[PDB]
Scaffold this active site. Structure first.
Site, PDB file in Angstrom:
ATOM      1  CB  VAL A 173      -0.885   0.015   1.265  1.00 32.87           C
ATOM      2  CG1 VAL A 173      -0.199   0.796   2.390  1.00 32.87           C
ATOM      3  CG2 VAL A 173      -2.238   0.603   0.932  1.00 32.87           C
ATOM      4  CB  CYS A 174       0.762   4.727  -1.046  1.00 36.26           C
ATOM      5  SG  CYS A 174       2.082   5.639  -1.894  1.00 36.26           S
ATOM      6  N   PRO A 175       3.217   4.059   1.109  1.00 38.67           N
ATOM      7  CG  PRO A 175       5.434   3.484   0.834  1.00 38.67           C
ATOM      8  CD  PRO A 175       4.191   3.760   0.048  1.00 38.67           C
TER       9      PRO A 175
ATOM     10  CB  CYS B  54       0.744   7.708  -3.610  1.00 44.88           C
ATOM     11  SG  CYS B  54       1.369   6.006  -3.764  1.00 44.88           S
TER      12      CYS B  54
END
Lengths: 175, 170, 175, 170, 175, 170, 170, 175, 170, 175
Positions: free
Chosen positions: I48-50, J169
């Site tokens: 998952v995005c940090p 992101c």
């Protein structure tokens, strides 16, 4: 206390007289017609004398004649029991004795009869167990002089006499 | 267990062989030279044969010779121990005996030696105590057949015989 | 507390008056028509006097006449009880008394009535137990003067009077 | 048990024979020369005859002669002990009495002597205490029939008679 | 806490107004149509004044008129209660009062209401108990000035007013 | 019980009569000369009449004359005690009052005096504390009908009147 | 766990390689220069191949060279350890062995190392102890297949080989 | 004790050989025909060498041929496991190994086998688990020299031999 | 609760911004001038995005300017923290970051701050610690949506802005 | 820990927006379509600023638009809540706000959420509770700067976005 109470039973492996091993020897299923003499001893391949084992092996027959069986137990395994039986008497062995030797490997039996000494080995004790699994007489000792093997035989007589013509004594005790 | 351990010391009324009555008889005192032979019996004025007392009275001297005192004990009171000695043996009396009789009125002694049967009376048992209050041998049964005095003696001998001459087993 | 509560029962061996031993003497199954007097005493073959046992044996009949039985107990065995009864009075004996003597060999009874002194022997106490197993009166003493054997008899009267024409007193108490 | 043990000492309001009111009457103090006779009764202003109080009031002097004080105790308060003495005996009053009356308002004393019945009132019982606060004799019953004052006296005599002249039983 | 909770009940013996004793007087079975005022006091045959008992006896009727009963209790027995009632007022007596006097002989009631002082006697307190056995108001005091007998009466009014035309006050409180 | 025992001392935020806000108001300090009158009330900004507060505000002076301080307490915070004083009485406000108002935010005080009802609010009750932090009188009810201020006063008088002139009851 | 912790030290009868019998053999003493290899086996006079004992007897010298003593332990008594050495290997004997044999008569040691099986006998397991009584490696199985002596050696080597020359893994 | 007992089971997430993650990998449902070798190792992305992981990955096939599966576990999450597998070997990575890597994220498994060191990471240990979920052999070590990966393979042979032609030895042991 | 209390101090391996590895990084030491911003994240190498890490890396400097250090923590080991920094961000790596990364291998820290979820991983949460190890603000959620770095900054500002210029609310 | 767990429910009295009091306001029965923001604050009639109450009252509508309700609670009674709402803003009042204000008079709610400070008042905290009564986000603070009222609104957005087009992101994070 042990005397007067039920003799604690056990099912352990024991080396018979004929040397074949019984895996689940049960005290109660191996009684004489009049009971049995259960006896202990410190350890096999002792350095001193098998005073105990000796005396008793010499009476096994006298006891049978009195209706009692002899059953000895030690905190040693049954392998070492067998070994001792097969080690030539002069080489320290015990010789092929005529009674069952029980292997109290987990020291439970010795504990049950309260002869287990310092969590390691059994004292030199003997118990007179009747046909109803009741311990009538008990003699335990902490010395080499295995006199109790004899003594027990003497009590077995006193018991069978008393049991018969009852108890008599000093002709002038009651008149 | 009792054997291999220090003999539980006590202190109670006792009726010495000479009918003198000691009030604070301590086991730890009245030892022999090599130790003592402490022994119990169910009850005084028994209708069964005193066997225990008889056999022990006889051998008192020998046990004595070989450096062993002989102390008898019962759950009965000195008053009765006494009265039992002063009784016509045909009247069931015990008769003047040589050894001291301890009165274990609170049954505490029978308990320490673990011979108390049903919180009532003591079992017929004898104990061999060496010069160090060490219980080295114990015989105990539950029938008149008095042989404790006997075997304890034989044991006293055997023991001592070995003290010197070993015993190259047969 | 004992008085006002149920008299604790017991089933112990007791030497009857006729000297034959009852193995299971039960307090409650041995009451007089109006109850009983249960009394204790230190020990048999005492060196002092049987003041207690004496006084009481002398009233056993008076009590019977009042509908009460006398039952004495001691922490001594029944054998020794018997003995004392058969030992000639002058020889220190007690003589063949007329009441049951109970053997509280395990000191349980004495404990139950709370007369057991220092875990060894019973105090000199007496209990008036009614037909409903209730202890109505109790006198315990710790001296040689066995007065309570008498005293009790006096209370048994006071009780049967009071029980009858009720209680009366100082003519000018209420008017 | 109570007998053969130290009489539980107390300290409470009391109404002395001379209607003076002591606030801290300690048993351990007001002893006789040979000891005392402590006694209880259910309750003041009873409709049953005071028997206990009567019989004890009479014998107060003798118990006294022979060196024995007489202390009465009830779970009632001094205020009522007092009021009970100052009451026409035909009005159920008790009348000026010679002995002190202790007020066991917290029932603690009745408890220590174990005469407290149902956490409410004390049983009719008397205790003989010697010069060493030792309970040597105790009589206790649950009926008016006052005979405690009586027997305690006879016991006081008997006891003392023996103090000297023994009693070669009959 | 007592107020707001159920008034603890009790069944004890109490000397009625007519002086005959009720063996099992029960608080709840003796309430007024609107409840009752239970009050305590230290002890009878007091040396000081019956301030309490006095004040209250004088209002018993006013309270009845308000639908409340007055029940006073003390750790004294009912005998002594009776006594005090029959002792001439000048002789220190209380005079034949018109309300029940309960005998909290075991001090349990006083304990229940938490007025039992130092395990011996009750404080001078009074409780307003309603028709549902709930204590609505309570005033306990530790001084001779038995004002609460009066005060209570004043509360019983305030309560019956408030209960009726509800509560009113400073005309400029909400507008 | 509370009465006959030392008044539980506390220390908390209080809004003095002069709207000054004390942070560590200790009861054991702000006593009167003869003691104090501590009193509780359910809650500020009540829609029921403040009765308790009213009746007490009036009599503040007299209670004061006779050497008695008057401390009010509620489970509400000083912030609100304050705001309640500064509110149009037609707006339900309480209006500047003479006595200090303690904020029993942790309800610990209501508990010590045992007036905490349902772990929420305090009961309408008042306590009379003498110069020795001794609770001598307590009145407590659960209805608006303010009469605590009243009776406590009458009690303050009565008490003192007796301090000297006794009271040969009628 | 056992590894990464101080090897439980013991002190018991042992039958040194030269049939001399030490009574107080302490592990914490008889270490090697780099540590020791303590190992267990079920029981003496077994009817199964002594495998453990054999494989260890051989390698005793090497383990020794590399600064590692070799101590064997069993729940059997020295009397039997002894007798086992003095027995014709065709008679099932073990034959004079180089390493000491410890008698764990109270099974306490097997427990400390946690190899006690069913409160009876020990499991076939070996432990590597460094010069600081630190258990650094442990192998333990439950079948004759003796390979502990083997692997422990290889481990003793490997370990030491690394002591110096690292091991840029492949 | 672990050996001789049932191998504690677990259901944790594990990164398979083909790198796809199994969410509920269960020890018991993933055994070889003859059992499995479960091994631990301190941590991933170690600074020293994957001695362990290496040795083992090189025998995975040898073990398969012997009917055993290899299952390694570490207190690291399965993400980091995956990472290490995909990090180029020269870059410190582990390379795409052929056995399941289990994520004992909660350290429970390590605890179960008692290899959990100081509440943080697993020791270097390996367990021989049979087809009946019983741990037959166990070797745990606290040094870099991941010899046990090899050693185990050697035991697996000794076991299959012994299991077959049983155990033989010194021709002169019994005669 | 955590807030308003002393920030639980710890000491563990950390991978400083400059990939240097401190073994005994104590929170109570590496504070800023005004305090610190301690923050957690589930696990390294996440798919998952940090988010947490990203948003915090950016703002590291500002938080720094305003006297606030930034310490990140995870239940992963320094070995992996390290390896995560040295990884191609397209390979899911984190890339050289400015703040230190603490390895909470025993999950003890996540526990002290109470962010340990299911005895496994830590919740995405951040804490503001002032110069006195006092937790003054805490934000904690359970979704990637990184906004902790953000809000904590804004909070750091706001806080300080107020340090001087108050805030006559609108 | 609170986040991730079920939001503890409560049934207390709350002054609604329209100022009429709800006696048994239940958190769960008063949720928005997407959940609710429950927030606390030390005390009413504060001397400082209602920063909290302010910020939140200004977003009540923004939140409604996001499917969330705003519910604030304080350890103050509902009377005082009401008061503050009706006290003119310049007079220190709070003004007729548009959200429910709960009265945690017993401090139980504060305790349940663990914001109860020193057994007296609530910290300034806010919780994002979803449609399933699960607290997803929580921010508690101990300073005047009621930023979280705002902040929460920001999270509610982040959440609804993330919930939709998921999370995105750095374009070069995985490729």
């Amino acid at each position: 206390m042990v005397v007067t109470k039920l003799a604690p039973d056990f099912k352990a492996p024991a080396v018979l007289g004929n040397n074949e091993v019984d895996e689940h020897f049960e005290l109660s299923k191996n009684l004489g017609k009049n009971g049995v003499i259960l006896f202990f001893w410190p350890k096999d391949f002792t350095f001193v004398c098998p005073t105990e084992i000796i005396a008793f092996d010499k009476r096994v027959k006298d006891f049978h004649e009195k209706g009692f069986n002899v059953i000895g137990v030690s905190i040693d395994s049954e392998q070492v029991h067998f070994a001792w039986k097969n080690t030539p008497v002069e080489k320290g062995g015990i010789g092929q004795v005529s009674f069952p030797m029980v292997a109290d490997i987990t020291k439970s039996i010795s504990r049950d009869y309260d002869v287990l000494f310092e969590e390691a080995i059994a004292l030199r004790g003997a118990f007179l167990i009747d046909k109803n699994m009741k311990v009538r007489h008990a003699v335990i000792n902490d010395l080499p002089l295995g006199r109790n093997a004899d003594e027990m035989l003497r009590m077995v007589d006193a018991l069978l006499h008393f049991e018969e013509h009852g108890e008599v004594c000093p002709a002038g005790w009651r008149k």
